[PDB]
Ligand SMILES: *[C@@H]1O[C@H](CO)[C@@H](O)[C@H](O)[C@H]1NC(C)=O
């Protein structure tokens with residue numbers, strides 16, 4: 394896709410800190426950009442939409458190539474249309490924003506410059522951020538994660554994509570998403586199936602895969618940490634059911650692991666650690682710091698800070714595993730006790746190390762789930778399961794919670810605030826900010 398300028402594009406600024414082993418941190422200035430899927434897509438020479446509702450213009454977009462030649466992405470009014478605002482080192486994403494249209498959520502990337510994404514090499518480093526999940530009820534997910542996207546949004550590889558990172562192009566993840574309108578410089582109009590439950594989305598014939606590190610998928614009820622390997626580390630297009638993931642016939646048939654080796658404290662047995670109120674170790678009605686360390690062995694460590702008190706990830710006992718570190722033994726025990734072989738089949742933490750050793754882009758989002766109502770995160774899933782089934786219970790939300798239309802109308806003012814992002818060598822982010 395190309396870019397149009399009927400509406401200007403001004404990325405909201407966001408500062409973050411880069412720390413060093415020597416004990417000092419320094420302020421960095423970046424900005425955020427909204428994903429292409431949320432943008433107005435119209436003809437290069439007029440205001441005629443190439444996509445409206447959940448259908449493509451058959452005249453402007455008869456096929457993927459023609460569509461990309463005829464159509465451009467335009468600028469975004471961040472606050473008024475998308476409910477995205479920034480203030481210093483703070484970023485807020487509103488749930489439902491009503492302007493001339495209704496907008497639900499947003500997926501944003503941290504930029505290095507106006508035309509390129511900031512890449513972070515995670516291995517041997519740690520990432521820290523503060524978060525306020527108090528306004529996120531059952532059914533919502535304020536996520537902060539990393540994906541192996543190209544810095545230019547794919548421009549150097551796909552010439553027909555001239556919009557680039559500036560317009561939020563090039564997204565990919567371990568779900569190998571097929572809801573993307575533009576992938577590899579072409580539209581995704583071929584094979585498009587409008588969603589039966591979502592008036593604004595659909596599934597195309599192609600998807601975009603890559604490694605994904607979900608540092609934080611959470612609401613005020615539950616939270617999960619989840620690495621997802623892929624046999625091809627970086628962004629790669631997939632076709633139809635060969636994509637795997639949620640909207641394909643064989644979920645485990647693709648190149649990526651859509652499940653991951655997840656760590657949810659509640660799912661592992663500690664139902665008193667994270668939740669709303671004083672009866673929980675970490676009280677989700679108040680702000681908290683989340684620190685994630687990527688050691689060179691490939692293992693992942695985690696500690697939290699609230700009101701100056703530090704809490705290491707709580708201990709879990711799962712089969713032959715005992716500890717609080719997300720490592721090979723944990724991932725193997727998880728598969729043995731809860732089932733599955735996807736994570737291991739994709740290479741486990743060894744293959745995932747190839748992703749963290751390379752550059753990854755920071756993504757911050759707020760979404761509701763039209764497929765499984767976020768039950769996999771904060772409720773019993775599948776819903777026919779009991780608490781007696783290992784790993785079935787992931788949170789205290791009702792299995793009737795999370796219906797998108799219901800939460801959109803009941804909690805439109807829900808929001809997540811991510812702030813004070815710090816990144817540096819292990820043991821460095823707790824030092825004084827610059
Ligand atoms: C949950 O984790 C916290 C923090 O480690 C700990 O103090 C508490 O004893 C744990 N509770 C259970 C039931 O394991």
Ligand SMILES: SCc1ccccc1I
Nearest residue numbers: 639651652653764765769
């Ligand atoms: S990653 C959560 C999950 C796991 C297995 C099947 C479907 C779903 I959504």
Ligand SMILES: [Ca+2]
Nearest residue numbers: 688690692718
């Ligand atoms: Ca270790």
